[model samples]
Target: KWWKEAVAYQIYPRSFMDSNGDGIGDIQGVISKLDYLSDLGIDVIWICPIYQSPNDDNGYDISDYKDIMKDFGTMEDFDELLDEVHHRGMKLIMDLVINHTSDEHPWFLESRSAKENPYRDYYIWHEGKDGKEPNNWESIFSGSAWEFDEKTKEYYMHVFSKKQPDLNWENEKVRHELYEMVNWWLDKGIDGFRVDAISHIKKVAGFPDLPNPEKLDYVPSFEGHMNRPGIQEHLKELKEKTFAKYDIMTVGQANGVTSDSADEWVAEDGGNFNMIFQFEHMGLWKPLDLIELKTILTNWQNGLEKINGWNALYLENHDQIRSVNKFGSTAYRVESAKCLAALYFLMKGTPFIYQGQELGMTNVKFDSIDDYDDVGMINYYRIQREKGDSHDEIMKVIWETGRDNSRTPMQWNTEKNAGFSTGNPWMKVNPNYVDINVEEQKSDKNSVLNFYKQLIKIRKQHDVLVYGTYKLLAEEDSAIYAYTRTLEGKTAVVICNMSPNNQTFEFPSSFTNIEVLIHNYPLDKNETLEQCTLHPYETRVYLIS
Candidate 1:
């Protein structure tokens, strides 16, 4: 119940704040901002990976499970940060990255050392076929998924980068080692974990070759290997081995979970996790469709309800472009931001706010290829170029949909480096920080940060926002999204004009003379619901008994 009524904020450690001014954010930096997060009404903070890594894919390619990264301070700093978080009555959840480990890990090193090594069975390895990779599978980071090892004369599987080898989950020893590491973190006072790329851990039994959709030399479809039959068994075992004993929350970064499989993964009855970060909305690549959006939302809402499962409501994260750039308009940025916040927080799910989201951060504008830093995006560009794609065309897609857009340094103040650090930032800060930084918005009552504070307060004060039954009102409307939440004879109506153009509202007959709870624009109480016009990107919540 604590998690159900909680407001979660995600912090990307490398960019939140730099305490020592080394240009990289450390645990002490996060500790310094505890009051800042506490003041923002955050109940939980989910930090991205800070484990020992080579920085190849940032901290995702973890080299050591039990140690802290050198750049991110030491284990003592992590202990202090955790103590500070708990001291403030807030919870901290670490990012669990067991899908793959950096090849520099001792287990991986020994596994690649010899064919008969005891650690050889720790990773997924096979002999090459016809002087090539064992299979035609492609890596998520580009190139073949199978990497050749001269010492062993074999190819090993790595779903991500060649430097991050996928572990063999079928091996009981490997699973036990992972579970022990998880318990160690839990014992250290971590509230829980945000499991990364969880659905990809289970491979298809035979590691079958995938049919290349692009007709390239190898197949790049990672979806085929996801949500295999043995995944649930492994997850259940994990839940029993380490998670069941602790009063903690676990959310899986599940890429393959659909409405049909939602209950099996996150249902409160017997599911493996408390909730999952589904990719339905993020899958809206180009040429956005309102109808499809409604369908996706409605299906999850209804499907999860059947088995008492919950959803994690989020729009912006570390891997995607900013929500303002993807779903909101730049001209009506503030209005659209408020609309999105209202929709996300008011929904019947746990709300997650990414860093800088409270201040309405937008995507960055890169000038050249040199401005980009994400390995995935860089590999995509190179691979596309190899296929003879024009530079102009490739840049267009990257500009619209690149991970670097979201990884830009957090804009804190108008000062140099956005007040994040005195030294050069690890990544470029958005130029709009001059006007959109937190120092400028923290005091303004109408600013996005203050609005987020207000939203959090409202959710805390109102139980209907959490336990109410959700019903879609204007399901067929393209320009407007309308829904209602009802609990214990109290009813709340949420009407959002998602478009930039003003639209007319035709409220139902029973919705007259309602009390306005929240609205993005100035309101005239005397105006009737019937024959009313909503301003562009306007959102209103009305409460009725």
Candidate 2:
């Protein structure tokens, strides 16, 4: 179970590095950093989409499944990058963006050309009546989900950007084609896939209207489509066709998947995927619900125990705000970042480290909406402005929740371009990069990067971190979160103070002789569990027999 024990590092290609100084990251840049990543103790690298695209939705709107994007280099560059990763005893996984294809794709171009084309059935298209959309379903990017093609006089379904039309998975031909493409990548010696938007593959048999609580003209709810019954069937078929034969890992981006149904999707024996990225704990709408988050994690931990299932633990990704900035206090940034790393990585799951996360990266505070590059944020700003929302208010929300915060170019060092590129970066690098960067922290043993290194080292050295049972303690605490992991007779207790104030906690009686394994605070050996007071944003992990 490489996936169970291995830690994954996600690289957003366009911001990782720019080898040719084009202001965009490429495979060569990734190749150059293989040593950096290997030294960081990463086992696998999950690179976000780099496939040929019209640059719509970044690389998510893929046009050519088999070719690499020109901005990201050629197929040769990718092959070299993969070989280097393997040479470093690491595996590489690509982003699988099959739920939809760019409108510029040959399949889509032909499909929209005429209603009678053979490829017309490859996508979901319906004839609209009375000059209105086929349905009132709104796109995730803000307009109607149905995009009217003047050429065909019909509307095609695009859950995301209108340039990205959803594929008709109901058609066997579509499934076969997608499976074939997946196999092609696997055959190329790539490790596996982080399946993107997998839950969107299956739409309701008949796309129906969803309740618009806001009474907006179009509803953005995909409740009818997400985690639908038929998705498991398709996933199982996909596994059997491509992934089952290879010793590859498959993690699905399953939006709306809950603890109640996680077993069906990620059970060790019967599930369809190795693990799935659930959004319950990592979104803006869901504020910090400590008890709720613990319950969600515990349910998955206990629920999956029956079949030896696993979970993927991550607090931030390319699509969300930075973890420390979102859930931790900025005044105590280092302590808070280490606290989060301890809380998530020591739990029962495979941990994912987003780029710059190890350096305690904070969110970017852009002056205006024009400074942002994310398509999702732009659409959100436009929609809010159209609804007469205050510009300041919308910008405030964007600053808090926008995805560009995580997409900023990785801060390698304090240089002209933050050592990311010689040319001007495609997106503005965060102003704090001078102080918060790998070059400055890699040498500091007390830095966030070193803390992450220590955390990963602990997980790799001790089976208790990977195979231990998770027990939630202090569930009612508003500012402090405490839990324990036990395997055999060895127990590891973790306590994190998430607030800016000092807090104290009492451990169960009879546990007196506890050895401190790791803690953000410096203390003497005499400082033990009985001394349960924690400083602001402090975290401690103790080994108890």
Candidate 3:
């Protein structure tokens, strides 16, 4: 229940801060910024994977569940970070990357060494048919999911990359080992885990091949594998064995969950998660139509309320492009960014802010593919190039959509490397850091950073914003979005001009005791509920009694 009202912050270990100046963000970097996060009103911090890894798929390809990544720092540094966070009245959650592990892991090494090895069953493997892959399911990185193991004379499956092997959750021994490791972390004072790629823990019954609708062999399809019918049992078992013993939070990153089926994953009663991140909103790419966006958000809000489930409110994360680029134009960057903040944070849910998002960080552009460090994007580029797609053609795609755009080094000040590190950064900081750094915004009251602080302050002061009943207003208006949240005789109305043109609103009824709570742009003196025009990308929140 504590998680319901708490605000979460996500930190990518490699991009957060570089205290040692070795170019990579280490645990010390995070420890040094504990005061900054506490000042921003962060209650929980969900750090991305920092376990010992081979750098494939970032840290997603873990080689050890109990140790810290050498690139990130030692286990001692992680312990200090946890102690400091707890001292500041904040919670720390690790990334539970259980669906897969790096092929270099000891279990995986033994699993791939021979067919009859004791650890062979630790991973998913199948015999090849007619000298081909066992199934036609394509990897998330644009290759066949099944990789032939020459030494073992078999094929093992990896949903993301060849170097990362999917774990067999059905095996009792494997589950026991994972549960022990999870308990080990909990014993060390971690609040919880942000479960990773959870929907595919259980594969299809037979790994059956599906029809290639793309007219290509080994087509990418999520059928049968993702969120299969029997995953609940495994999840419940995991909770009973590990998490149910502690009072903490768990947020699942589930890709295939929809509004209709969300209740099954995060319902109030027997569910395994406190809140789950659904991709219905994240998957909406390219020229986002306003109508579709409204419908999808409305569906989730209503659906989750009906099931007594909570939502994890967010717009930007490490996996997607910046909210300024996706939902609003960068030309009106400050106004649009503030508008976005008010839109999502005012909704009925726990808000999770990504690092640097409060300063309105924009996406980065690299001239060459060589400049990008995202393994997924790099692998897809090579895949397309092998199919005769030129560098220019693929390069355009990188500009429009690339994870590297979001994974750049954090910009702290106007100095070199955006004051992130004294040495060369592992990734380039955004060029706009000169104007958007925290030092500049921290002093300016009108900065995006200040606006975020105001929102967090308002949310904490007004309990109505957390438990209020949401009602949609102006549902069909494409240029404007309006909604009301009411609790116990108090109501807060939020309106935003999502388009580049001025829009007018007609109140359904007259109200008394109207007071301005917050606004992105300077409010006009004559503005009232009866009739008013909203400037381009403007947002306003009013409290009424």
Candidate 4:
């Protein structure tokens, strides 16, 4: 119930701020920004993993669950951050990255020491075939998912980075340890969790080689089938035994979960989670080399098609290319990005706003492939580079597809380091900050940041926006993404132009007289529902009688 009308903003701690001038964000820095988030009408702030790690996967691989990363600060700092978040009338969702742990973690260290060690069964270890990797299973990061440990004389499975070893959830001891760690965070007053890569918790017993259909570096693994079913069963037990005790909310990052699976997992009796983040629409353009308006339209339809259960709505995250550049042209990117936000936020789901997203932030111009940092980005870039790519060609691929796009520091004000830190920041802030920071946008009512603030305010301030049932107004041949939110006798029609060119929209005769509740763009004095026209990337919400 706390999240019915919620909008969650994800904060990557290392990139958010720096209080000690250490070039990385810390818990104290986040504590100082509670007022900023509260003013933005945000209902929940989900922080990225801040637990102890080697920073290999940017904190996704945990070493110790009980302590905070020294760079992030101490347990005392996390307590203060949690206190402030709760005090601000907003909820907090901590990242749960329990599928794996840093190989340097004590558990993995001991697990690899001896085959007979108690920790040996905590991870998956297999004898090599002919002194080579047992299978050709590819790692999501690059090369092989199995890394040979000379100390153990066996290969260990790591779907991601070799530094991050996959946890064997089949081991009840490991599962219990994760549950206990989760409950600890919840008891500390955190409202919920955004479980990360949770679908990968249960892997198929035998490491099977995937069909090289894409014939590319990475292939879609059938690991989902052997993994998700068992994980969901354990997750149900977890919710009942751990989360339910603390009344903690959960949003699962379930990649293989369909809408029907989601209903069983999150709906009323579904034991697994409160909701799931299914990438039903996010990967539409991935199958094809096409990225255009038609792709966006198709994705929109795909997202709307999933009306059977709860979904997590987001366009950008720490691991993605920026939404502004990913979906539109440079000339119309900013306005179009804001327009997309309007169209998606009002959709039926828990809308997630990544940090700096409202400012229409875009992918930074990396000079070369070597300038990239993320493992996934490097793996993709390495393949491109090995194929005779030049500096420009490689950077072009990175610009279009790199994690640095979202990992950039928040552009708070027009200052060095974008006012996110007083020290040299870890990641480069988008140079567009001078023209797009929050301070500058706060004055311009038409600024994308301000537009989002207004949109969120309107949605939360009205019950119809929260409790209404959404219905697509016209599906076949409409230039606008028009939908109606209906509850009781009240109906609100929201229309948005999907292109960079103005078009005329004939209003339905049934709703001739309507009051404008909100408009995300400037309106002409001649605006009338009779033959109302929309400019490029325009959005409007009307209260119909």
TM-score of each: 0.97, 0.97, 0.98, 0.93
lDDT of 2 by residue, 468-489 (tens): 9988888888877888899987
lDDT by residue (1-545, candidate 1, tens digit) is: 88889899999999888888788888888898888899999999999999999988889999999999999999999999998899899999999999899999999999998899899989999998888888888888888898999888899998988888999999999999999999999998798989999999999877877776677777875655677777998999999999898999999999978988887799998999999999987868732476677788878888888889998889889998888878778888999899888877788888999998888888876768887888887888899998999888888878888878877878888999898889888888889999898888888888889889988987888788888888888778888888888898678888888888899888743533467788889886777777658898898888877
For residue 170, give model 4's deviation from the true position in Å. Answer: 0.9
lDDT of 2: 0.87
Off by over 4 Å in 3: 508-510
For model 4, how big is the CA root-mean-square deviation? 2.9
lDDT of 4 by residue, 388-409 (tens): 8876776776787778888888
Which residue ranges in model 2 land beyond 4 Å of their true spot? 284-287, 509-513, 524-528
Candidate 1 lDDT (Cα, whole model)?
A: 0.87
Q: lDDT tens string, model 3, 465-508?
A: 88888777888888777888889878989887787767787764
Order of models, best TM-score first: 3, 1, 2, 4
**Per-residue error (Å), model 1, residue 281:** 1.2
Measured by TM-score, the strongest candidate is 3
Error of 3 at 496 (Å): 1.3
Error of 2 at 388 (Å): 0.9
Query: Clashes in each model (backbone N, CA, C under 3 Å)?
Result: 0, 0, 0, 0
Against the true structure, what is every candidate's RMSD?
Answer: 1.5, 1.6, 1.3, 2.9
Distance (Å) between predicted and true CA of 274, model 4?
1.3
TM-score of 3: 0.98
